[PDB]
C-alpha cells in the first residue's frame, strides 16, 4: 500500500489535474493571454501615476504663494 506521494513520484502522467475551484483552467491547447493582463495593469499604472502627480503638485503648490500676498502686491 505505497503512499500517495510515492505513487505520484514513481508514476508521472500527462493527465495533470489542478484544483479549478476559483480559477478555471484553459483548454490544454490554447495560447496564453499574456498581453491582456499587461494592458489591464497598464491602465492601473495610468491611474497610479496620475494620483502620484496630483499629490506631489498639491503639496508643493500648497507651499507656494497665496492669494493674500498675490492681491497685496500692486
Amino acid at each position: 500500500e505505497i503512499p500517495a506521494t510515492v505513487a505520484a513520484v514513481k508514476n508521472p502522467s500527462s493527465k495533470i489535474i489542478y484544483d479549478e475551484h476559483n480559477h478555471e483552467r484553459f483548454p490544454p491547447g490554447d495560447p496564453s493571454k499574456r498581453a491582456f493582463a499587461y494592458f489591464v495593469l497598464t491602465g492601473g499604472r495610468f491611474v497610479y501615476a496620475s494620483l502620484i502627480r496630483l499629490l506631489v503638485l498639491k503639496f508643493v503648490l500648497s507651499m507656494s504663494a497665496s492669494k493674500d500676498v498675490l492681491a497685496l502686491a500692486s
Binding site: 498639491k58 503648490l61 504663494a65 497665496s66
Partner: protein
Amino acid sequence: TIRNQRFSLLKEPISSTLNQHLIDYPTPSNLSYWWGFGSLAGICLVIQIVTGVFLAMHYTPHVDLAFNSVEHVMRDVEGGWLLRYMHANGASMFFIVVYLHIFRGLYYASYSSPREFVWCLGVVIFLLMIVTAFTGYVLPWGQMSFWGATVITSLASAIPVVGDTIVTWLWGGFSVDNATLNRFFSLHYLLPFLLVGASLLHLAALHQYGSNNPLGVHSEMDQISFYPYFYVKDLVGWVAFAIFFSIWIFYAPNVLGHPDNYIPANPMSTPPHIVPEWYFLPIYAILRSIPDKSGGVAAIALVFICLLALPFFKSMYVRSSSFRPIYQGIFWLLLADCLLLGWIGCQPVEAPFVTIGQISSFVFFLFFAITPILGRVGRGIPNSYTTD
C-alpha cells in the same frame, strides 16, 4: 554559498535588511484582508505626518491668531482646503483602521502567546494616538476644542495627593489659555515621531515571532514570501481605503465633525453640548457612567489595565475563535457593546442614558473578567468529547 562575487543587489548589505524584512519575510499563505488594516494604519500615519507638516507651515499657535490662521489655510492658500480636510478626516481614518486592527486581534486572539509584547506595544501606541489626536484637536481653538480641553485636563485633578498641582503645571497658569495652546502645539508636533518609533518596535516584535492566521494553528509548514503575494493584497486594501477617504474628503468633509468648533473660543460662554470627537466617545461614556469622578478616572485607568492584562491569561490552548463558538458569541457581544457605548457617549447625561451606560461599562469589563474562565473550563475539552 561563498559570496565571492555579487549576485543580487537585494542581497547586498545596503539592501539586505530591507530584502529580508520586507521582500523575503515569510508569511502564512492563508491571511485574509484583515491584515491589510495593520498594513494600512502605517499609511494613515504617513499621510497625517506629511499633511501636518505642510499645515504647520501655515498655522500660528497664538491665541489671537489660531482660528484666523486655520481659515487662512481654508481660503487663501492654494490647495489649503485639501490639506486641512485631509488632516482632519485622516485622523478619523487612522482611528477607524486602528480600531479594525484591534478588533481583528481580539477576534483571532492574536494577543495570546507568544505575542504579548506585540499587544503591549500596540496598547502603548494606542495611548500615543489618543494623546496626539486630543492635543491636536485643541489646536484650531474653536468652542469645542477649548471647552473639551478645559473639561478633560481639569478632570486630571482627581488624583488625591497632587491633583491641583499637576493641573496648574499642565495649564501653565490658572485656566486653558495661550500658554496651554502653545504647549499643546509643540507636543502635537513632537508626539507623532515617537509614534513612528513605537510602530517600528511593534513591527520588530511581530517579525520576531511571525504573524498569526485565521485558523490560529502553527503555520511554518505552508508559508510564502511577503512580496509580491501580499504586496498586491495590501495594494487592493490601499486603493479601497483611498476611495473611502476620497469620499470622506470631497463629499462629506464635515460629517464626522462637530459644528460648534467653527465658533471662535469664548471662555465666558459654554456650549450646550461639550463632547469629544467620535473616537473618544466610548472612553468618555465609561468615564461619565461611573460616578464620583475620581472613580471615573480609576475606571479609565482600569480599561488600559485590562487591555494590558489580556495577553497574560490562563491556558486557553485553542486561540482562533473560528473553533470557539462561545468565545465567538462573546466577541460579537463585545463589539456590539462597544458600538452601543460609543453611541451613548454623544448622548446627554440624562435618563435613561445613565443606566444604559452603567450597564454597558459592566458588560465591557465582564468580557475581560469572563475569558480566563472560558479558558480554564475549555482546558478539559478533549477528555470529554473523545471517541475512545
